[PDB]
Amino acid sequence: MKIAIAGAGAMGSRFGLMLHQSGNEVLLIDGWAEHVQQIKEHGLQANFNGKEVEAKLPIVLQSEVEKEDQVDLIILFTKAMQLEKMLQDIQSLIKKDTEVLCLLNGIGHEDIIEKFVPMENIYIGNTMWTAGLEGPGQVKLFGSGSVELQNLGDGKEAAAKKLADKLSESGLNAHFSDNIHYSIYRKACVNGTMNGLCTILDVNMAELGKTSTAHKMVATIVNEFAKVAAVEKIELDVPEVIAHCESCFDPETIGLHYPSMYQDLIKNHRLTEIDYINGAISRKGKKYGVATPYCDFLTELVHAKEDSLNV
Amino acid sequence: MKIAIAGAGAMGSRFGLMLHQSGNEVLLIDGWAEHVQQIKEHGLQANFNGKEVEAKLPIVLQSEVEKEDQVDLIILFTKAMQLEKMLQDIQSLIKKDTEVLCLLNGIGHEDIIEKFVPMENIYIGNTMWTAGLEGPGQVKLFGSGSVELQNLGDGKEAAAKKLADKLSESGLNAHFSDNIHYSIYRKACVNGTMNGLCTILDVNMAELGKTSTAHKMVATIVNEFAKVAAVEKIELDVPEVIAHCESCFDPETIGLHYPSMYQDLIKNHRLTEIDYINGAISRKGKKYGVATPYCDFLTELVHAKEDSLNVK
């Protein structure tokens, strides 16, 4: 395969390195100029379990994707809010049969991706590998992991299984799963409850859990996610998903943490990903005729809070 | 009339005194023990206009009404959060034909009151009188004022007009108005938007108005109020009511002010009246089969914020 790695951070660098080592033709694409320049001049340097390895991986600044060959596969490691811009910047690499594998754990990315490749050529996945970015052009590659992925498109299960096999040839331990839609929805329920509620109430997850109405608010939101998912033939186990959301309240695990959205807005004074979480459910709700008032309101509140902080 | 004044604070004391002077039989009911005892021993003392007057008004602690005669009329001067308890405590004074006049400026009180008297006997009003409570059993009463009131039960306009006449005989300058119920809903829309949103977002009203979504949030909430009001035969002009809510955003007038709910919770670390504003709309919504998710959620959020501040 000719593969483009759209987002050459720690995980993209792992995938790019592993795929390159097995004889694939890889292009790294990244927005961090010092990262790009270091890798151009000296290759990607990695501590791999833990041997010092180098690889001269092709790399381009995402804004300078002019002359490169078109690719068979794009693997996406770009945050939701940067995804459409990345795709716009790299669209010259897309040929008719180019497949896209998303490893972004979020809902509705397909709708952006669909503008650039047909649904039949889009695959969604989760990665359980770890990776660390030590400095520009410098990665440390931890230990063990796996990839699970699924076709979007209808009738593309066989194609998804070949894609998995191909990634597995590079040691990525990839597998087909028909459970990826489900797991993305389940994770989004956590992201659609803890993030917005903590951000608006100014509490960590444990303190949210100590409130008298947290269970009601979480349950109501999860039911909205589930109504929308049911339209897409995904039947969430609502009680389990609610319990999974509420497991974040445990101060012994992650409860004392303030969630990523709180870090973005309250700490970093940056715009939140709310439109890609509760907003995505609101958008589907409008399309499907499904009421999502808590997702609507929470989204509206978080935007108001952003505005109030001049973010 | 035999009249009970349920809440003998400054305004209740004015009404009680004025009603007494004109030959009505009045019973004051209050929860402030020192207030009750002072009036028992020395009567109610008032600086009227501005003569030092007194009246040996019957008065009972609210939990101690079992010796008293049943009454023809109860006039309520009790805050929302104390209303159901007051009614529970005084319910032995209620006979079949007892009328209740609420001078609490809020929405949904009728649903609490309805547990004790039928809707046909409930009246709602506003008072524009002033009154000051100087100390236990001591009031100062100055200047002029008026009362406007309305029947809640169908076909009770004539009864409301007589009630107004009766209060006017005691100098209270009372009048029937058919616009009280509407104006109470319109005011509650303001109280159901500015209060909760400012409290949760930590903003004054002007800062709320500067946000991109304030209009949507206000509009959605007002529509919930209006859907519930329509079931009760009150047809709000939604665009006007929305504009009225949004007039609070003006920094040149009231915008720089933090609303009362924000003062209660964020400043005074006290429980809010949220259950008697958005909560009242949520309760009616459940009863009427009308979805009120923003009122539900805002109520839930304000309670969570109370809890997070250890206000419980």
CSV table of N, CA, C and O in Angstrom, one decimal, chain B residues 226-268:
chain,number,residue,atom,x,y,z
B,226,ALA,N,-45.1,29.0,27.9
B,226,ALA,CA,-46.3,29.3,27.1
B,226,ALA,C,-47.1,28.1,26.8
B,226,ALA,O,-48.4,28.2,26.7
B,227,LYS,N,-46.5,27.0,26.5
B,227,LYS,CA,-47.2,25.7,26.2
B,227,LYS,C,-48.1,25.3,27.4
B,227,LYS,O,-49.2,24.9,27.3
B,228,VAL,N,-47.4,25.4,28.6
B,228,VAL,CA,-48.1,25.1,29.9
B,228,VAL,C,-49.2,26.1,30.2
B,228,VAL,O,-50.3,25.7,30.6
B,229,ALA,N,-48.9,27.4,30.0
B,229,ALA,CA,-49.9,28.5,30.2
B,229,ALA,C,-51.1,28.3,29.3
B,229,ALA,O,-52.3,28.6,29.7
B,230,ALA,N,-50.9,27.9,28.0
B,230,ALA,CA,-52.0,27.7,27.1
B,230,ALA,C,-53.0,26.6,27.6
B,230,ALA,O,-54.2,26.7,27.4
B,231,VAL,N,-52.5,25.6,28.2
B,231,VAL,CA,-53.3,24.6,28.9
B,231,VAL,C,-54.2,25.2,29.9
B,231,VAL,O,-55.4,24.8,30.1
B,232,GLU,N,-53.7,26.2,30.6
B,232,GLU,CA,-54.5,26.9,31.6
B,232,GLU,C,-55.2,28.2,31.0
B,232,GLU,O,-55.6,29.1,31.8
B,233,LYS,N,-55.4,28.1,29.7
B,233,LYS,CA,-56.2,29.2,29.0
B,233,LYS,C,-55.6,30.5,29.1
B,233,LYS,O,-56.3,31.5,29.0
B,234,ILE,N,-54.3,30.6,29.1
B,234,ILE,CA,-53.5,31.8,29.1
B,234,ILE,C,-52.7,31.8,27.8
B,234,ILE,O,-51.8,30.9,27.7
B,235,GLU,N,-52.9,32.7,26.9
B,235,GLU,CA,-52.2,32.7,25.6
B,235,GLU,C,-51.2,33.8,25.6
B,235,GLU,O,-51.5,34.9,25.3
B,236,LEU,N,-49.9,33.5,26.0
B,236,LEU,CA,-48.8,34.4,26.0
B,236,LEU,C,-48.4,34.9,24.6
B,236,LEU,O,-48.4,34.1,23.7
B,237,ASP,N,-48.2,36.2,24.4
B,237,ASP,CA,-47.5,36.7,23.2
B,237,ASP,C,-46.0,36.4,23.3
B,237,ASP,O,-45.3,37.1,23.9
B,238,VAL,N,-45.7,35.2,22.8
B,238,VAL,CA,-44.3,34.7,23.0
B,238,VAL,C,-43.2,35.7,22.5
B,238,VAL,O,-42.3,35.9,23.3
B,239,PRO,N,-43.3,36.2,21.3
B,239,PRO,CA,-42.3,37.2,20.9
B,239,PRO,C,-42.1,38.3,21.9
B,239,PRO,O,-41.0,38.7,22.2
B,240,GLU,N,-43.3,38.9,22.3
B,240,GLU,CA,-43.2,40.0,23.3
B,240,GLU,C,-42.6,39.6,24.6
B,240,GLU,O,-41.7,40.3,25.1
B,241,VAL,N,-43.0,38.4,25.1
B,241,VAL,CA,-42.4,37.9,26.3
B,241,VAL,C,-40.9,37.7,26.2
B,241,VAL,O,-40.2,38.1,27.1
B,242,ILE,N,-40.5,37.1,25.1
B,242,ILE,CA,-39.1,36.9,24.9
B,242,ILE,C,-38.3,38.3,24.9
B,242,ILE,O,-37.3,38.4,25.5
B,243,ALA,N,-38.9,39.3,24.1
B,243,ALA,CA,-38.3,40.6,24.1
B,243,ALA,C,-38.2,41.2,25.5
B,243,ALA,O,-37.2,41.8,25.9
B,244,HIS,N,-39.3,41.0,26.3
B,244,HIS,CA,-39.3,41.5,27.7
B,244,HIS,C,-38.2,40.8,28.6
B,244,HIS,O,-37.5,41.5,29.3
B,245,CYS,N,-38.0,39.5,28.4
B,245,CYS,CA,-36.9,38.8,29.1
B,245,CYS,C,-35.6,39.5,28.7
B,245,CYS,O,-34.7,39.7,29.5
B,246,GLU,N,-35.4,39.7,27.4
B,246,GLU,CA,-34.1,40.2,26.8
B,246,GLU,C,-33.9,41.6,27.1
B,246,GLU,O,-32.7,42.1,27.0
B,247,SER,N,-34.9,42.4,27.4
B,247,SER,CA,-34.7,43.8,27.9
B,247,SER,C,-33.8,43.9,29.2
B,247,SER,O,-33.2,44.9,29.4
B,248,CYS,N,-33.7,42.8,29.9
B,248,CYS,CA,-32.8,42.7,31.1
B,248,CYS,C,-31.4,42.7,30.7
B,248,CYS,O,-30.5,43.0,31.6
B,249,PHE,N,-31.0,42.4,29.5
B,249,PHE,CA,-29.6,42.5,29.0
B,249,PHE,C,-29.0,43.9,28.9
B,249,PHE,O,-27.8,44.0,28.7
B,250,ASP,N,-29.9,44.9,28.9
B,250,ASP,CA,-29.4,46.3,28.6
B,250,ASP,C,-28.5,46.7,29.8
B,250,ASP,O,-29.0,46.9,30.9
B,251,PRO,N,-27.2,46.9,29.5
B,251,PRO,CA,-26.3,47.4,30.6
B,251,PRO,C,-26.6,48.8,31.1
B,251,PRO,O,-26.3,49.1,32.3
B,252,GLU,N,-27.3,49.6,30.3
B,252,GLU,CA,-27.6,51.0,30.8
B,252,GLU,C,-28.8,51.0,31.8
B,252,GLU,O,-28.9,52.0,32.6
B,253,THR,N,-29.6,50.0,31.8
B,253,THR,CA,-30.7,49.9,32.8
B,253,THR,C,-30.3,48.9,33.9
B,253,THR,O,-29.8,49.3,35.0
B,254,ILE,N,-30.7,47.6,33.7
B,254,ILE,CA,-30.6,46.6,34.7
B,254,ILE,C,-29.5,45.5,34.4
B,254,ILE,O,-29.2,44.6,35.3
B,255,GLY,N,-28.9,45.6,33.2
B,255,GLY,CA,-28.0,44.5,32.8
B,255,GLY,C,-26.8,44.2,33.7
B,255,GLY,O,-26.3,43.1,33.8
B,256,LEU,N,-26.2,45.3,34.3
B,256,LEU,CA,-25.1,45.1,35.2
B,256,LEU,C,-25.4,44.4,36.5
B,256,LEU,O,-24.5,43.9,37.2
B,257,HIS,N,-26.7,44.3,36.8
B,257,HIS,CA,-27.2,43.6,38.0
B,257,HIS,C,-27.1,42.1,37.8
B,257,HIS,O,-27.4,41.5,36.7
B,258,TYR,N,-26.7,41.4,38.9
B,258,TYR,CA,-26.8,40.0,39.0
B,258,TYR,C,-28.2,39.7,39.6
B,258,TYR,O,-28.6,40.3,40.6
B,259,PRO,N,-28.9,38.7,39.0
B,259,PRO,CA,-30.3,38.5,39.5
B,259,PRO,C,-30.4,37.9,40.8
B,259,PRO,O,-29.5,37.3,41.3
B,260,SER,N,-31.6,38.0,41.5
B,260,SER,CA,-31.8,37.5,42.8
B,260,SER,C,-31.3,36.1,43.1
B,260,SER,O,-30.8,35.8,44.2
B,261,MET,N,-31.6,35.2,42.2
B,261,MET,CA,-31.1,33.8,42.3
B,261,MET,C,-29.6,33.6,42.5
B,261,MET,O,-29.1,32.9,43.2
B,262,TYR,N,-28.9,34.4,41.7
B,262,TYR,CA,-27.5,34.5,41.7
B,262,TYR,C,-27.0,35.0,43.1
B,262,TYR,O,-26.1,34.5,43.7
B,263,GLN,N,-27.7,36.1,43.6
B,263,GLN,CA,-27.5,36.6,45.0
B,263,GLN,C,-27.7,35.6,46.0
B,263,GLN,O,-26.9,35.4,46.9
B,264,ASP,N,-28.8,34.8,45.9
B,264,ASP,CA,-29.1,33.8,46.9
B,264,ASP,C,-28.0,32.7,46.9
B,264,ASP,O,-27.5,32.4,48.0
B,265,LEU,N,-27.6,32.2,45.8
B,265,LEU,CA,-26.8,31.0,45.8
B,265,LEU,C,-25.3,31.4,45.8
B,265,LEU,O,-24.6,31.0,46.7
B,266,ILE,N,-24.8,32.2,44.8
B,266,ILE,CA,-23.4,32.5,44.6
B,266,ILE,C,-22.9,33.4,45.7
B,266,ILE,O,-21.8,33.1,46.2
B,267,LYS,N,-23.7,34.4,46.1
B,267,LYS,CA,-23.2,35.3,47.1
B,267,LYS,C,-23.6,34.9,48.6
B,267,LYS,O,-22.7,34.9,49.5
B,268,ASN,N,-24.9,34.6,48.8
B,268,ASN,CA,-25.4,34.3,50.1
B,268,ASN,C,-25.3,32.8,50.6
B,268,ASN,O,-25.6,32.5,51.7
